[PDB]
């Protein structure tokens, strides 16, 4: 099952996370001509763009047919911009294609060639498809964590594929993560851009260095007993996440140690099992999460033996629900059940009390 979909997500996850990682600091000494601010004020990238477009173009080199929910569109972009964004693609191929190359695996083709700005700007808009609760699709966060990236810390290039509203298959690439930072040790070949994490559904969470991508280490979550002895895991940006209701959930259950940082690298954490418990409360209940912010961590923390649900009602996440999830906020964990479940209702419980 879903072989030759693991090939083309962990190798288009694998390009994009050197170029995000070689980009990040001229990204942010030419932040005002490789940013701009979107009709949520949020930011997007010249880096953000690229990575889309390497992997969708990607994605239909190999599945021509196939539906995309991407983060990003090319609406508006100038053609400077798109310009820029197709430099930095042909720069990162250079020095992937020198040191990288995959044998067998095409990144493009004669239908989707990727040569020219208009062909940037198809292949970014191919994202534009709204999900739901049938049938295959490809979703795609290029860089989650952006106002990480753009603050020189931690990121990821984040894909998923979901079949009938269920998360399939997710690859996560943390092309900053350097594992010596949380306690553990690093495997040959992380410095030049991270690690790769990813599974399918049934068969196993697994991650590499980026560089390598080719051995396999098997992951599972930890299993602490003494509460009192887990580490959170929490989003560093305060507008994100309701930090001061996440941190009354830990007074509550005396969990005093804490991690934080952008993106879905908080699952990977989680599934390597260096930390027992993420928590992503919203600040406001109207906020629907995006699906992209989630998928790919959905499905390797699943596979690694862990818990993730809401944060109010402790029922599993919906990803047939189209761009967004119907529930409010987000909780993971190492388990067992018994902790998820004191985790969710203390969370239900300082929500309730506001
Ligand atoms: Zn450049
Ligand atoms: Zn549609
Ligand atoms: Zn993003
Ligand atoms: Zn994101
Ligand atoms: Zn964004
Ligand atoms: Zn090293
Ligand atoms: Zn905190
Ligand atoms: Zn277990
Ligand atoms: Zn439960």
Redesign the pocket.
């Known amino acids: 099952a879903l072989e030759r979909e693991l090939l083309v997500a962990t190798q288009a996850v694998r390009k994009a996370s050197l170029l995000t990682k070689r980009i990040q600091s001229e990204v942010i000494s030419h932040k005002d001509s490789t940013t701009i601010t979107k009709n949520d004020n949020s930011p997007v990238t010249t880096g ?1 763009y690229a990575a889309q477009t390497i992997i969708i173009n990607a994605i239909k080199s190999n599945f021509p047919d196939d539906k995309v929910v991407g ?1 990003e569109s090319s609406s508006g972009l100038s053609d400077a911009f798109v310009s820029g964004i197709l430099n930095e693609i042909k720069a990162n191929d250079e020095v992937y294609n020198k040191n990288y190359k995959k044998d067998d695996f095409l990144f493009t083709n004669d239908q989707f060639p990727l040569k020219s700005l208009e062909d940037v700007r198809q292949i970014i808009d191919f994202g534009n498809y709204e999900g739901g609760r049938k049938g295959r699709f490809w979703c795609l ?4 964590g ?1 106002k990480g990236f753009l603050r020189g810390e931690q990121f990821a290039v984040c894909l998923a594929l979901i079949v009938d509203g269920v998360v399939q298959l997710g690859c996560i690439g943390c092309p900053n993560l350097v594992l010596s930072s949380y306690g553990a040790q690093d495997l040959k070949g992380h410095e030049s851009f991270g690690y790769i994490f990813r599974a399918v559904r049934g068969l196993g969470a697994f991650y590499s260095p980026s560089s390598d991508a080719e051995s396999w280490t098997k992951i599972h979550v930890r299993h602490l007993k003494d509460t009192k002895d887990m580490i959170t895991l929490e989003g560093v940006e305060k507008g994100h996440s309701s930090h001061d209701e996440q941190t009354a959930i830990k007074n509550k259950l005396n969990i005093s140690k804490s991690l934080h940082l952008d993106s879905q690298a908080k699952y990977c954490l989680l599934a390597l099992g260096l930390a027992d418990v993420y928590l992503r409360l919203p600040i406001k209940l109207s906020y629907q999460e995006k699906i992209w912010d989630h998928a790919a961590g959905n499905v390797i923390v699943h596979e690694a033996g862990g818990i993730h649900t809401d944060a109010m009602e402790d029922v599993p996440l919906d990803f047939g629900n189209g761009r967004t999830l119907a529930t409010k906020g987000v909780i993971a964990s190492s388990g067992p059940r018994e902790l998820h479940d004191l985790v969710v209702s203390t969370s239900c419980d300082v929500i309730q009390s506001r």
């Open positions: 953000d983060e966060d290029p860089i989650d952006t």
